[PDB]
């Protein structure tokens, strides 16, 4: 629910930071996808 | 959040002794009957030559007045009147004005928030800086304007909204703030004051004759560079015979320079 | 002048416990008094008094206590703390972590016996950093310039070539040159191969006349690893503040220093603090890092470029974390650039030389330099952002300007950041390389450079 | 008096024959007189946490106990000095030693001896007269600014037996002698006070008069009060220097005390280079701000207790100038690095760690620090008010405010000036974020504003609303483009831009933005909000009609009004008198009203 | 930290007792 | 009224006895003089920090965040002195106050207080940042003694049921808001959008209230019904059909 | 304890050792042997060994650098494919993924229990990598030579024409170091280089 239920350890801190970089990268890539499609969508509406 | 009992009663005996030391300076002759009567409780305990330990034990016993806030209000009113009377040392205030200003303060809600305290702090601020008044137009003008202020305060008090006093604070404080190299702006400010005062001789007799001559010489010396013609320079130079600063000197300078503005 | 009295020697070893030998009946012992131990076989050994209490003196031996006994072992107390035999002739020479020479040369004939601990530089006597030190590396000198007297750690990680960067800085570094510059290179917990690399790569390449080299190996005693930074900084203080030299100190692994502090704290039976390091780790790191800067009325100045192997590649760890609090910005070596074979692997995006605004200016470099670095930063950052766009949209979806930021990124990594281990670039040549990359864009696109600077330098 | 060193383990020295010593008594250990405090007693033995490096201290070295706990000397010569964290004066240390180092075990007195300052006794005092703690027995004219009131220490009281006549005297000369219970005390201009103990007062008052910084963004949107406690997020890209230098040059604060609580070596020297070079206008003269300030300074490598105590020395000094009747401002520059030095003491003492490794008492150490602020009725006879404000900079790790030192500080301080890197990267100085910043003192300042600036409370309210609408509308602007918004939204965005770029931004290096008086701050914001109210009236009053008003119609009919509004920042109080600036603002109000009369 | 502070306290007590037993 | 004040500059160890003095005075007034007393304990977090300080300074065995292992019992020796007692007309009521460190509800200070007291009143930035004074978030709030106090003669007979349905509607309102923030209204149902509108109507009328505005429970329940009327009768799934049939059309 | 390299034994070891072969749970789980992560492992001895390589194996250093580059660009391309699929990938990015698959599955991968892979000599090792990277260079040229041209040589046109060479490339691992001596292996791989060049020449 509120947490991923990974048990606390110095390993788990490392894995969550790796996943956070993963999720922030995936956010930015999907945001670039959204921006590129939104630009085309506005251009296509103008057309 | 407060004081230890020893500190609290120490502050009481201090304030009680101090109100008496203030009476001895605001009224060495005992003329101010209504003011002295209002402090009779604290004054008795200070006038009797009790030891510090005896009056402290009397404060612990509550035979002395022992409310620090009550003593603080009483002491504050007397100190603010004492500051007023001290700040006007060259001009004694009329006794009826002292008791009147005291009654206004006694009846006021809070002195620190009062316009009286603002005006008095301005009177002190202008007065205090003069202890280092080396010869220069700014300092000569400030000694002059402050001497007028001290006389007017001795004639009107602080709570009276005399338009001259109120304007004189603004002009004096502006000249005090005005940068020391700004000789033409200092000259223009002081010139403007003498033109705006209703009297033809606002500084006459208020300050030493040597200082009056220094004012006349200051106005002539910082006017003369504006004249290009030797005849008009000589006509303006001749004004240095006068000792008292007057509107007629300014009007003489103004005529002679405004003639030079068309004679160049 | 000198301690005229003779030294005492004690057989009275009341016990041994790990690295500690506990003398008793000792006369007036000092905290941190240096002692010489003699073993039963006549072997000499070194040590310091780690605790004193009445007649007891708990010596921490430098070498392990192996061979010490209660009855034949003799401890000689020198009556003073450890002092460094220091002199200007320490330039062109190689020392172990205790300050003994290892270059086949003689002991140091000293000009002074400075207290190893040093003293705090008086903050009113401290002067602000005022001019650049060239490291010779373009990713530092053209993007993260180092002011003479700044502290700036090179954050790195296990397996990255930071020792090669440290060595290349130590060869190439110098003043701007529009003999009075000296390097104090000091290396802690170094594996014997990297120690051969540091010794050989300086001695083979002429630089020695302007470097003093301290080596402490991974298998050398943990207490000599604490002393190594203090010798380095004591020599750097002598060279700068007694001898006017501009000095660059290269402390090559602050992590193994911090691990040595962890052991010295365990030696006093102290309870471990944050992440197992001592509570006072900030003051010990500060006692190393703040022995730096310029001082009023002297030309000498100690700059520090520490190198710092980040545990687990994470800046949050107390070693990098406390270092970021004390030092004026940081350089990051990056595994991403390393795997891409960009040597030096210096990532100019997270890196920041905090005092570069002081280091760069008219009469210290070309007047354009600060503007060039700002525009290069923007173009590399935007190039990375456009590389993330390319990854989503493919080349046919990009604009002409996006293709310029990609051409810029490719050429910038492959010409500006990439240097090689022996090519030396002065700040002037780094700026001409910078301008060669900036010229990829039309003049009006260089938005962080003034039009006056563009008119003087944009044409190639 | 002398005890003897029993043992040494790291920075901790055990001593013996110490039977007459006290908990937290300050002690000199070793022949070189290293400073340390008694942290434990165990009989005739004492354990001393030494501050300085203990290398070379020997068993049987002397232990000379100072009778008092860690304390600040107070008197003339405080002004202009660079003290360290234990009140060793760095200027005297440099001058006397002729060395770039602080030598281990300095003995230099905090106030220089043999400087015979001009002293005037209090004209009301007499032999036999009563006197109490906080009574002024004289004044020392150490600087043209600070007439330094000399006053009886808060515990002392009695009958005056001697006062020095007018003359030249120093910190060691006897100035006052008094008797209490048959016992005589001799006093000098120097006073000594325990650094961790609050200096007592007649009443701690509510804070109600503004501490003007001269910066529009601070003084308009998130005001601070004399006596108030505020904080700043100190970082490289924050722009803290713009606040700090402006406060020292222009604030209505009679004394400034700045405390370096473990700044970086070079960053400390940048501060100590600037404050001498900073100058201020007073009485039409120009003078160095060193006439009205003192710097406590500590680099990160200074002794742990010198860092930890530096914050407490700053406020002990500041309370002493409060007690003189001065409105003191204290700046602390690195409360995070202070909490690290505090943590290092706990780590050496082996106290159990609380949240994030900080000590359990960190909340109380911060809270008892900020509670030493405020306005006060001082002790003693003149009934004088005085105050200490405290600016406490904090360094959230990576911008995370949840660290206990930062979280507690923002929980305690009544004002926060949220400096933001995104603003400083665009040169938006002072770079204060107008959404993240806050001030709790508004309810208390409203008394002053209702008296002196009655229009201001409506204006600050509308300003925050306009700025909040910009942030909320910006999502719609990105989602559908600015052109798709309503006319009431479009004029709202333009006024928010006008406020952001021409009111909240202030380039303090220029002649015109150098200082902004509160009258100019009200007049600028009054005109901007008057234009907003008229623009809003025109668009809303014409909505759904045939004839309709929009931002383009307004701009086409009155583009000179938008230009005149932007020009208001360039109007300079040094060149133009306050009456002239007021008349110009009255003209802009009449101009915009007549301009809107062409549309409605 | 707590466990290790207790261990160090037990060692301090055992050191003191071992010295007292020699008097 | 009686006040016991320990200020942030006062000695920290006095905070151990500061609430106990208040309670010891309350026990005298309530149990010996038969008065009713409301006892306010301001900044139980600053109290708990005095315990954390003493604990750390004594090397006491730590619980979570380094508070003493006995913190629950020390807090209970304070809190449990609330109550009525047999044959005495008096009553001690306590309203403790605590600021949660970093707003964390799982922090030992709120958490142990949570176990001891008869439910919690909670205040939240989600209300305060929107100027919704008093910023009392109902969902984390509860009262363990409310169920026994609610009922006929003490209150209107419906009160228990009105409460139960207000919690359900406001809870669904928060959950549909959390959904909308990801997906927009296009993936919400018309009923979900009605719970989102209920949340807006609810906070603006039920919670929002002036610093001198006094409301009885009966006016609060009339407001509660005017909010519950946002849904059709059959949607009010926590309320019995008889209560709905009497009150829903009013 | 959980394969975590932040563990204190690993941390102390990493400050000391000049070579570290970081084996990875994800590779071991998918039964990639010998399970070495090629983006976490390192060898500080490269500096010294480059003297031996430049004396005996002059092609190897270029190949070693290009190999690690191809493998790092594989991680970049492999991450983005999770979101974008193939749609953004340039024809050179496809050639990078194809050769990265050959290098990962047919060069880095090696079966420790099967006699064809129990041990691999250096002459076989350098020859395998020489062929796979010579294919990358020639394929990358074949694509990029057609940039803005009237017709593009795509990754698919390459992959179809080169199908025999791709099968030969993957097959290089099967040569038995016992029965097929270094002379025979080098000769076969020289025929693969000639076949590879001639197969690419049909598109140039």
From TrEMBL, chain A:
<comment type="subunit">
    <text>V-ATPase is a heteromultimeric enzyme made up of two complexes: the ATP-hydrolytic V1 complex and the proton translocation V0 complex. The V1 complex consists of three catalytic AB heterodimers that form a heterohexamer, three peripheral stalks each consisting of EG heterodimers, one central rotor including subunits D and F, and the regulatory subunits C and H. The proton translocation complex V0 consists of the proton transport subunit a, a ring of proteolipid subunits c9c'', rotary subunit d, subunits e and f, and the accessory subunits ATP6AP1/Ac45 and ATP6AP2/PRR. Interacts with SNX10.</text>
</comment>
<protein>
    <recommendedName>
        <fullName>V-type proton ATPase subunit D</fullName>
    </recommendedName>
</protein>
<comment type="similarity">
    <text>Belongs to the V-ATPase D subunit family.</text>
</comment>
<comment type="function">
    <text>Subunit of the V1 complex of vacuolar(H+)-ATPase (V-ATPase), a multisubunit enzyme composed of a peripheral complex (V1) that hydrolyzes ATP and a membrane integral complex (V0) that translocates protons. V-ATPase is responsible for acidifying and maintaining the pH of intracellular compartments and in some cell types, is targeted to the plasma membrane, where it is responsible for acidifying the extracellular environment. May play a role in cilium biogenesis through regulation of the transport and the localization of proteins to the cilium.</text>
</comment>
UniProtKB/TrEMBL annotation, chain B:
<feature type="modified residue" description="N6,N6-dimethyllysine">
    <location>
        <position position="119"/>
    </location>
</feature>
<feature type="modified residue" description="N6,N6-dimethyllysine">
    <location>
        <position position="191"/>
    </location>
</feature>
<feature type="modified residue" description="N6,N6-dimethyllysine">
    <location>
        <position position="170"/>
    </location>
</feature>
<feature type="modified residue" description="N6,N6-dimethyllysine">
    <location>
        <position position="15"/>
    </location>
</feature>
<protein>
    <submittedName>
        <fullName>Uncharacterized protein</fullName>
    </submittedName>
</protein>
<feature type="modified residue" description="N6,N6-dimethyllysine">
    <location>
        <position position="247"/>
    </location>
</feature>
From TrEMBL, chain D:
<feature type="binding site">
    <location>
        <position position="333"/>
    </location>
    <ligand>
        <name>Mg(2+) 2</name>
    </ligand>
</feature>
<feature type="binding site">
    <location>
        <position position="263"/>
    </location>
    <ligand>
        <name>Mg(2+) 1</name>
    </ligand>
</feature>
<feature type="binding site">
    <location>
        <position position="239"/>
    </location>
    <ligand>
        <name>ADP</name>
    </ligand>
</feature>
<keyword id="KW-0479">Metal-binding</keyword>
<dbReference type="Pfam" id="PF02874">
    <property type="entry name" value="ATP-synt_ab_N"/>
</dbReference>
<keyword id="KW-0963">Cytoplasm</keyword>
<dbReference type="InterPro" id="IPR005725">
    <property type="entry name" value="ATPase_V1-cplx_asu"/>
</dbReference>
<keyword id="KW-0547">Nucleotide-binding</keyword>
<dbReference type="InterPro" id="IPR020003">
    <property type="entry name" value="ATPase_a/bsu_AS"/>
</dbReference>
<dbReference type="InterPro" id="IPR023366">
    <property type="entry name" value="ATP_synth_asu-like_sf"/>
</dbReference>
<feature type="binding site">
    <location>
        <position position="506"/>
    </location>
    <ligand>
        <name>ADP</name>
    </ligand>
</feature>
<keyword id="KW-1278">Translocase</keyword>
From TrEMBL, chain G:
<comment type="function">
    <text>Catalytic subunit of the V1 complex of vacuolar(H+)-ATPase (V-ATPase), a multisubunit enzyme composed of a peripheral complex (V1) that hydrolyzes ATP and a membrane integral complex (V0) that translocates protons. V-ATPase is responsible for acidifying and maintaining the pH of intracellular compartments and in some cell types, is targeted to the plasma membrane, where it is responsible for acidifying the extracellular environment.</text>
</comment>
<feature type="binding site">
    <location>
        <position position="112"/>
    </location>
    <ligand>
        <name>ADP</name>
    </ligand>
</feature>
<feature type="binding site">
    <location>
        <position position="110"/>
    </location>
    <ligand>
        <name>ADP</name>
    </ligand>
</feature>
<protein>
    <recommendedName>
        <fullName>V-type proton ATPase catalytic subunit A</fullName>
    </recommendedName>
</protein>
<feature type="binding site">
    <location>
        <position position="33"/>
    </location>
    <ligand>
        <name>ADP</name>
    </ligand>
</feature>
<comment type="similarity">
    <text>Belongs to the ATPase alpha/beta chains family.</text>
</comment>
<comment type="subunit">
    <text>V-ATPase is a heteromultimeric enzyme made up of two complexes: the ATP-hydrolytic V1 complex and the proton translocation V0 complex. The V1 complex consists of three catalytic AB heterodimers that form a heterohexamer, three peripheral stalks each consisting of EG heterodimers, one central rotor including subunits D and F, and the regulatory subunits C and H. The proton translocation complex V0 consists of the proton transport subunit a, a ring of proteolipid subunits c9c'', rotary subunit d, subunits e and f, and the accessory subunits ATP6AP1/Ac45 and ATP6AP2/PRR.</text>
</comment>
<feature type="domain" description="ATP synthase A/B type C-terminal">
    <location>
        <begin position="51"/>
        <end position="150"/>
    </location>
</feature>
């Amino acid at each position: 629910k509120d947490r991923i239920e990974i048990f606390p350890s110095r390993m788990a801190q490392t894995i969550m930071k790796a996943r956070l970089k993963g999720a922030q990268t995936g956010r930015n890539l999907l945001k670039k996808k959204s921006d590129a499609l939104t630009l085309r969508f506005r251009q296509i509406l103008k057309k | 959040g407060g004081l230890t009992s020893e500190q609290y009663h120490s502050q009481v005996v201090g304030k009680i002794g101090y109100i008496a030391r203030c009476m001895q300076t605001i009224d060495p002759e005992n003329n101010l009957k209504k003011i002295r009567e209002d402090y009779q409780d604290v004054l008795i305990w200070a006038e009797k030559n009790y030891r510090f330990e005896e009056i402290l034990e009397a404060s612990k016993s509550g035979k002395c007045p022992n409310d620090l806030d009550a003593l603080s209000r009483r002491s504050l009113i007397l100190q603010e009147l004492l500051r007023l009377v001290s700040s006007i040392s060259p001009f004694k205030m009329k006794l009826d004005l002292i008791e009147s200003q005291y009654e206004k303060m006694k009846q006021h809600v809070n002195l620190w928030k009062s316009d009286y305290h603002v005006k008095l702090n301005q009177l002190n601020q202008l007065t205090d800086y003069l202890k280092n008044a080396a010869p220069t137009p700014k300092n000569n003008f400030l000694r002059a304007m402050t001497s007028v202020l001290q006389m007017q305060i001795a004639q009107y008090g602080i709570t009276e909204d005399n338009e001259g006093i109120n304007q004189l604070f603004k002009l004096g404080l502006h000249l005090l703030a005005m940068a020391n190299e700004k000789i033409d702006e200092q000259y223009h400010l002081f010139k403007g004051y003498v033109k705006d005062q209703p009297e033809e001789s606002p500084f006459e007799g208020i300050l030493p004759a040597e200082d009056q001559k220094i004012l006349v010489k200051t106005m002539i010396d910082y006017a003369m560079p504006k004249l290009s013609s030797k005849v008009l320079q000589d006509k303006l130079s001749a004004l240095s015979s006068s000792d008292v600063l007057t509107k007629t000197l300014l009007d003489s300078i103004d005529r002679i320079v405004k003639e030079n503005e068309k004679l160049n | 002048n000198y301690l005229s009295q003779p030294r005492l020697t004690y057989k009275t070893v009341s016990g041994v416990n790990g690295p500690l030998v506990i003398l008793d009946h000792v006369k007036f012992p000092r905290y941190a008094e240096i002692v010489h131990l003699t073993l039963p076989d006549g072997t000499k050994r070194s040590g310091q008094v780690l605790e004193v209490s009445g007649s007891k003196a708990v010596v921490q031996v430098f070498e392990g206590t192996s061979g010490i006994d209660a009855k034949k072992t003799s401890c000689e107390f020198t009556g003073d703390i450890l002092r460094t035999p220091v002199s200007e002739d320490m330039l062109g020479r190689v020392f172990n972590g205790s300050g003994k020479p290892i270059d086949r040369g003689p002991v140091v004939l000293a000009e002074d016996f400075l207290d190893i601990m040093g003293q705090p530089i008086n903050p009113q006597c401290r002067i602000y950093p005022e001019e650049m030190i060239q490291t010779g590396i373009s990713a530092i000198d053209g993007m993260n310039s180092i002011a003479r007297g700044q502290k700036i750690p090179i954050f790195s990680a296990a397996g990255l070539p930071h020792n090669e960067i440290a060595a290349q800085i130590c060869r190439q570094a110098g003043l701007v040159k529009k003999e009075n510059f000296a390097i104090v290179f000091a290396a802690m917990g170094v594996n014997m191969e990297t120690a051969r690399f540091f010794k050989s790569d300086f001695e083979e390449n002429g630089s020695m006349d302007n470097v003093c080299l301290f080596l402490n190996l991974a298998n050398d005693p943990t207490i000599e690893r604490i002393i190594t930074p203090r010798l380095a900084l004591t020599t750097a203080e002598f060279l700068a503040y007694q001898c006017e030299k501009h000095v660059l100190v290269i402390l090559t692994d602050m992590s193994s220093y911090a691990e040595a502090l962890r052991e010295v704290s365990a030696a006093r039976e102290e309870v471990p603090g944050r992440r197992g390091f001592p509570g006072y780790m900030y003051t010990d790191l500060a006692t190393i890092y703040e022995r730096a800067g310029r001082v009023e009325g002297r030309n000498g100045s100690i700059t520090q470029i520490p190198i710092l192997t980040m545990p687990n590649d994470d800046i949050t760890h107390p070693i990098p974390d406390l270092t970021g609090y004390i030092t004026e910005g940081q350089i990051y070596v990056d595994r991403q650039l390393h795997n891409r074979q960009i040597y030096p692997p210096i990532n100019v995006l997270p890196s920041l030389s905090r005092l570069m605004k002081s280091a760069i200016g008219e009469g210290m470099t070309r007047k354009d330099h600060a503007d060039v670095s700002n525009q290069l930063y923007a173009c590399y950052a935007i190039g990375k952002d456009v590389q993330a766009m390319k990854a989503v949209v493919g080349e046919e979806a990009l604009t002409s300007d996006d293709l310029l930021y990609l051409e810029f990124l490719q050429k910038f990594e492959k010409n500006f950041i990439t240097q090689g281990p022996y090519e030396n670039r002065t700040v002037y040549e780094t700026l001409d390389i910078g301008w060669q990359l900036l010229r990829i864009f039309p003049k009006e696109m260089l938005k962080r450079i003034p039009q006056s600077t563009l008119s003087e330098f944009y044409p190639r | 008096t002398f005890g003897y060193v029993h043992g040494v383990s790291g920075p901790v020295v055990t001593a013996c024959d110490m039977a007459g010593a006290a908990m937290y008594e300050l002690v000199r250990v070793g022949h070189s007189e290293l400073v340390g405090e008694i942290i434990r007693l165990e009989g005739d033995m004492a354990t001393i946490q030494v501050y300085e490096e203990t290398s070379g201290v020997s068993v049987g070295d002397p232990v000379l106990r100072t009778g008092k706990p860690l304390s600040v000397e107070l008197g003339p010569g405080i002004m202009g000095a660079i003290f360290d964290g234990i009140q060793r004066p760095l200027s005297d240390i440099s001058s006397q030693t002729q060395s770039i180092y602080i030598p281990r075990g300095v003995n230099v007195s905090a106030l220089s001896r043999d400087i015979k300052w001009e002293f005037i006794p209090s004209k009301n005092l007499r032999v036999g007269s009563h006197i109490t703690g906080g009574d002024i027995y004289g004044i020392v004219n150490e600087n043209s600014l600070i007439k330094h009131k000399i006053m009886l220490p808060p515990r002392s009281r009695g009958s005056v037996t001697y006062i020095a006549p007018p003359g030249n005297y120093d910190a060691s000369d006897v100035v006052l002698e008094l008797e209490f219970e048959g016992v005589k005390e001799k006093l000098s201009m120097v006073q000594v006070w325990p650094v961790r103990q609050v200096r007592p007062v007649t009443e701690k008052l509510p804070a109600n008069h503004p501490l003007l910084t001269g910066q529009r963004v601070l003084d308009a949107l998130f005001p601070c009060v004399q006596g108030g406690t505020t904080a700043i997020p100190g970082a490289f890209g924050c722009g803290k220097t713009v606040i700090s230098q402006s406060l020292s040059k222009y604030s209505n604060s009679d004394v400034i005390i700045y405390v370096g609580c473990g700044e970086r070596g070079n960053e400390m020297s940048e501060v100590l280079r600037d404050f001498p070079e900073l100058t201020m206008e007073v009485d039409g003269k120009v003078e160095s701000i060193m006439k009205r300030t003192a710097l406590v300074a500590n680099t990160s490598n200074m002794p742990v207790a010198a860092r930890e105590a530096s914050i407490y020395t700053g406020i002990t000094l500041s309370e002493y100038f409060r007690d003189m009747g001065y409105h003191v401002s204290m700046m602390a520059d690195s409360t995070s690095r202070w909490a690290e030095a505090l943590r290092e003491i706990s780590g050496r003492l082996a106290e159990m760690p609380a949240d994030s490794g900080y000590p359990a008492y960190l909340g109380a150490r911060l809270a008892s620090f900020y509670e030493r602020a405020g306005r006060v009725k001082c002790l003693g006879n003149p009934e004088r008010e005085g105050s200490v404000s405290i600016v406490g900079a904090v360094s959230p790790p990576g911008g995370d405010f949840s660290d206990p030192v930062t979280s507690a500080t923002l929980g305690i301080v009544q004002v926060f000036w949220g400096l933001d890197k995104k603003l400083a990267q665009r040169k938006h100085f002072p770079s204060v974020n107008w959404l993240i910043s806050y001030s709790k003192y508004m309810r208390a300042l409203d008394e002053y504003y209702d008296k002196h600036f009655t229009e201001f409370v409506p204006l600050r309210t509308k300003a925050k609303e306009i700025l909040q609408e910009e942030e909320d509308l910006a999502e719609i602007v990105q989602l559908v483009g600015k052109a798709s918004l309503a006319e009431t939204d479009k004029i709202t965005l333009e006024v928010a831009k006008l406020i952001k770029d021409d009111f909240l931004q202030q380039n303090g290096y220029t002649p015109y933005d150098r200082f902004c008086p509160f009258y100019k701050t009200v007049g600028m914001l009054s005109n901007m909000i008057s234009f907003y109210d008229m623009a809003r009236r025109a668009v809303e009053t014409t909505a759904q009609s045939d004839n309709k008003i929009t931002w383009s119609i307004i701009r086409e009919h009155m583009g000179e009004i938008l230009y005149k509004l932007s020009s208001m920042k360039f109007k300079d109080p040094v060149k133009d008198g306050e009456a002239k600036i007021k008349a110009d603002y009255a003209q802009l109000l009449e101009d915009m009203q007549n301009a809107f009369r062409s549309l409605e | 930290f707590y466990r290790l502070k207790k261990i160090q306290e037990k060692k301090k007590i055992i050191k003191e007792k071992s010295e007292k037993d020699l008097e």
